Amino acid sequence: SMIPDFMSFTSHIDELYESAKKQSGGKVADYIPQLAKFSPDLWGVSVCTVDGQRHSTGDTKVPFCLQSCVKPLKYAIAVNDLGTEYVHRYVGKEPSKLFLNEDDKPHNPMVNAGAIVVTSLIKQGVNNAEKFDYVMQFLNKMAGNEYVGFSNATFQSERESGDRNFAIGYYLKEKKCFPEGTDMVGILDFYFQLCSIEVTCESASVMAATLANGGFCPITGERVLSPEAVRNTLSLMHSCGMYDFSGQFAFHVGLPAKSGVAGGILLVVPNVMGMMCWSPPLDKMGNSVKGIHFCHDLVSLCNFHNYD
Amino acid sequence: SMIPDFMSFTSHIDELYESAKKQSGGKVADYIPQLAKFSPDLWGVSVCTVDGQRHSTGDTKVPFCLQSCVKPLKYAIAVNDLGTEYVHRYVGKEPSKLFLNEDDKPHNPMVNAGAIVVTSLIKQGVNNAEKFDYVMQFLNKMAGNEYVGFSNATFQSERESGDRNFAIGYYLKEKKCFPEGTDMVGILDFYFQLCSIEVTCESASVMAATLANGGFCPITGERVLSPEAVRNTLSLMHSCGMYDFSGQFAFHVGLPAKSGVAGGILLVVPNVMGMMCWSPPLDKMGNSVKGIHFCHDLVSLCNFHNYD
Amino acid sequence: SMIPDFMSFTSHIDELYESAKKQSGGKVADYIPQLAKFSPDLWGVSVCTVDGQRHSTGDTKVPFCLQSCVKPLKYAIAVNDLGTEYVHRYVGKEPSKLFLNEDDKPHNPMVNAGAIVVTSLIKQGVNNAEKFDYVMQFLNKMAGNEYVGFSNATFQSERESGDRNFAIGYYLKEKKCFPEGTDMVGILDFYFQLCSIEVTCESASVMAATLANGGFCPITGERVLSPEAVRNTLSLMHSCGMYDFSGQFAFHVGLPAKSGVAGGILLVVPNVMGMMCWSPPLDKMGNSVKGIHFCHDLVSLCNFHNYD
Amino acid sequence: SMIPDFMSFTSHIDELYESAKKQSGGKVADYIPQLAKFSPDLWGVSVCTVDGQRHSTGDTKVPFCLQSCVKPLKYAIAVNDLGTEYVHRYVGKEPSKLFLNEDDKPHNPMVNAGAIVVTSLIKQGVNNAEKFDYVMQFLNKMAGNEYVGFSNATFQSERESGDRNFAIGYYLKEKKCFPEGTDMVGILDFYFQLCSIEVTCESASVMAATLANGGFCPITGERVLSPEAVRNTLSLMHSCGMYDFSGQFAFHVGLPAKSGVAGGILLVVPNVMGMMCWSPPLDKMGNSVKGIHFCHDLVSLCNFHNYD
Ligand SMILES: O=C(Cc1ccccc1)Nc1nnc([C@H]2CCC[C@H](c3nnc(NC(=O)Cc4ccccc4)s3)C2)s1
Ligand SMILES: O=C(Cc1ccccc1)Nc1nnc([C@H]2CCC[C@H](c3nnc(NC(=O)Cc4ccccc4)s3)C2)s1
């Protein structure tokens, strides 16, 4: 452990939060109205160390949708229940516009085509209502029963306007990427629902902290995810987590992270802490402008980089 | 005109038909059962000169589906009713796996994504029943009322299994390639129906002959297609007509042609004649093995190449 | 023949020349100084029918370099001496940034990598001085001994600055695209020299006219090129001749043409005439802005399109 | 530190070495004779912890060429002398056939085009003899003066046959990727020389160990590389180090590594140890078959993965 005094670390979290606050650039997502509603000035950072110690600053109790931040989490669930070898019969492990790599598999679980296929592996045979409860049970344990809600509003707007996800769905059905007997449209329904699950910075930072803690929820001690599943999820967050910025993020920050279109950035410092940054304004790559800035400052200050 | 005596030309058509007959290679399409039914040994060649003179050899009265051979024809209809400039707001004009070129348009009207968009331009506002009748009225005039039927069997099997066409449909809806207010699924329905229209070599060769005759049906004299529409259709048949073989076909044969998965090859010798070759066995590119062979022999014998 | 009275056709050539003259757009090539010297306002059009009848307007006696306009011509020479089958062991026949197609061959003889390989097939074993004389002997016959000169200035500037052509040369040597025992650097030298041969609109239009005349020089009657070689050259000019505009040129104009960076456009109306348009200002695609305009107007006026 | 007793760790190194030894697959590189000479059965593993403790098994004193294993090392030198910001004006930082990414920069310092450009940044103005001495001085310090030799044989064979590297060189000169005033051919000469530097497993493992030790040579204590330079080098080894296997190596092994065509694998366990595995037989990706196997077994046994 490299935190010595947790109290003066939060003092530095605060100053970093404040530096990020001045970065007004970006553009709140507006392709469904449930994302355009949100205020550019919303900005919250929540820490949960592997100890269970906590600290928030700013808008950490306002709920927003995980969106793509749920991709690592359901990937972790699928590996937990099924193991590396099974899951990656169906999805790549590399960061390579296009839907399918050279082997007719989605490139990785962090791109839509990947997460769609990952969704079709969780808890098969059962209908969508118990599928969603099963994953929800899992998400709660990762957050130690803190806020995990649901936005029916974005679910309907994402289903009704996600023609690209439907194109993905049919293409994957064509090139035979699902387990046989998969209702593809039902799987998309599940996908949209998972994308519409809601968290706060405070509850998400606890989810990231169980990933930071080999699968053990730091505020309940409970074993949630297998060590295998956490190792996999972190590797792919390290390399595929930030859209087309995953490359420069691995180089300059080098921590497992996964951003979403609601402006969350699920950040993991392994064996140290979990975090969730949130500011709805996104840069041209699709990442929280305040989050990106903050993540740079955090590493250039406390030397948290993978190789420091 | 370079046919002198039509009687001894048919004698040479016969010998060519016979040479092609010995080419047993290929593999009948079998992705729906309505195509696997068909007999490898079926082989027919039908000529209809710009005079109206006719000649068939072999299985020229057995009906088969146009499939992709309908792509030039509905493209011709759309240009006829709407002109070059309107149509190619929506679809490319070049032979460039991928659905959309660099300008987010289907590459050309001879690839599925192109023909789907072309379908969405014909006779808009009207419902699908009158759309289909309108195109059917048109197809009859191009064939001088000879056989134009319909295979409800392949329509249902093509709709129920064409997940790639649905993926295309949703992607084009995402990247906004349809005229606004287009029911995309209804357009796919129309697309599948047009692909399921049936002809015989004898009726198709008459369709190709109106294309060979600046839009005038050689056996009714009636003006069917505008000169613009015929010129466009022939250019794109010359360059995009034979799947991934269009390149080598333009080089070595250099005549407007359009093949389909039922093993038809709709061939046009401009200001000379129309033809329809048919043999259900396809080569690795998707073209009638006997048709390809025959088309080579026809040009290397009567010097019909574009530049001879 | 569709020219009736040659005298009133030239009257229409004149009016078209005049319409093109008002199109001041473009940008004279300036990557070597031997091209930046040239005056934007230079504009000449030279016709030579298959009869031998001639007509020029404007700057038709000012010499400029063929540059890429020599690509069809040396391709014609190679097929003449070696036949389709041999030549296309080494170079593609299709219009597919990249140097080599999927079969590790240059896409076609009209892209640099293609023309470089074509150059390595002409008159092998002999040294470069007799190679150049042999091709020069050939170029003279195609022009009926009219102006064929040489710009030593551009040869040296093209050799000294053509690092992309050298990169091409080494890559083709790596992927083994030359006949064995080929001095690759010597072949580039030959390539640069051929690109630096000089013509006038008046002499070039005679070269294009032998291509328009199945290989027979219309003003000497002499057989210059085999019918095979002319047919091949014209097909590839039809489809690969205008850089990234070859597609839209085949659709909208549909005549064999080949442009070069000096602003020439070598145009062929088969069995009718040869032409050479020249205006050093190029559009963003690399084609003579006045030439492109003129070529459109010529077809939309005298209905010379391939399929009209 | 997670090694407790170094003595029983070497006992496990031995058993792993022995397991790898049974893997006879692969194919010794044979594109120059200086690589075909080598014996398939050569197999050595050398460890050098951050303590300075050492252990070898097998052919650890037989010299071989670094080849691409020198790419991280000269990248480290360039960042050391010039800093992140300068170096990556000229070369990418991501793992994206093709020479240049979308910004006309080599994708990363671990692909030839990258390492060539990196070579052109080291110690500019000086001639090649002092350039090579400067890098050699540096390589010695990283190895604590242990074996660093030179194979003039492979230098000449690599220069005389490396047409692909020359094609790279000219293309980079065309797209202006070098600092101005760079003699490109001289830079290739330098590149070939650096690729021909020789090490043994025992001396290389010491080089990897200074990378494992924030830039401090564990057996001389001397500061060799800046912390910046080591952090960068390790990130790019983690993601770009194993040719087209870097992806699956990051997922399944997750340690900075860099392989070469002589069958070396320069392995780094950060803050633990350096290693050099060597077995000339390569798999289809270009990696030491025994090394790949060994690297898997090492992580699945001592839980050395980045995220374990
Ligand atoms: O974006 C553009 C713009 C553009 C134009 C020109 C060049 C590049 C890009 N134009 C596209 N239009 N439609 C596309 C995809 C959409 C998803 C579904 C389809 C596919 N998705 N993935 C695929 N993968 C493979 O086939 C395997 C493979 C491909 C490439 C290299 C190696 C292996 S096909 C087509 S992209
Ligand atoms: O322009 C760019 C920028 C860029 C951005 C985005 C996407 C592509 C490209 N970057 C380049 N980097 N290098 C280039 C030259 C020099 C090295 C060799 C390159 C090639 N020459 N021939 C090739 N063909 C094949 O490998 C086989 C094949 C692959 C895929 C499809 C069909 C055939 S690749 C061309 S351009």
Residue numbers in the entry:
A (entry chain A), B (entry chain A), C (entry chain A), D (entry chain A): 219 to 314, 320 to 531
The authors write:
Trans-CBTBP is structurally similar to BPTES, with the exception of a 1,3-di-substituted cyclohexyl ring in place of the acyclic aliphatic linker on BPTES. A racemic mixture of trans-CBTBP enantiomers: 1S, 3S and 1R, 3R were used for co-crystallization with cKGA. The cKGA: 1S, 3S-CBTBP was found to crystallize and the structure was determined at 2.74 Å resolution. However multiple crystallization conditions did not yield the crystals of cKGA: 1R, 3R-CBTBP complex. This indicated a higher preference of the 1S, 3S stereoisomer for cKGA over the 1R, 3R form. BPTES and 1S, 3S-CBTBP share similar symmetric halves, and have identical hydrogen bonding interactions with cKGA. Unlike the aliphatic linker of BPTES, the cyclohexane linker from 1S, 3S-CBTBP forms multiple hydrophobic interactions with the side chains of Tyr394, Phe322 and Leu321 from both the neighboring cKGA monomers. The interaction of 1S, 3S-CBTBP with the cKGA allosteric pocket is primarily mediated by hydrogen bonding interactions from the thiadiazol group and hydrophobic interactions from the cyclohexane linker. Unlike BPTES, the cyclohexane linker of 1S, 3S-CBTBP improves the hydrophobic interactions and imposes rigidity across the center of the inhibitor. The calculated buried surface areas of 520 Å2 for CB-839 and 460 Å2 for 1S, 3S-CBTBP further validate the greater relative strength of the CB-839 interaction.
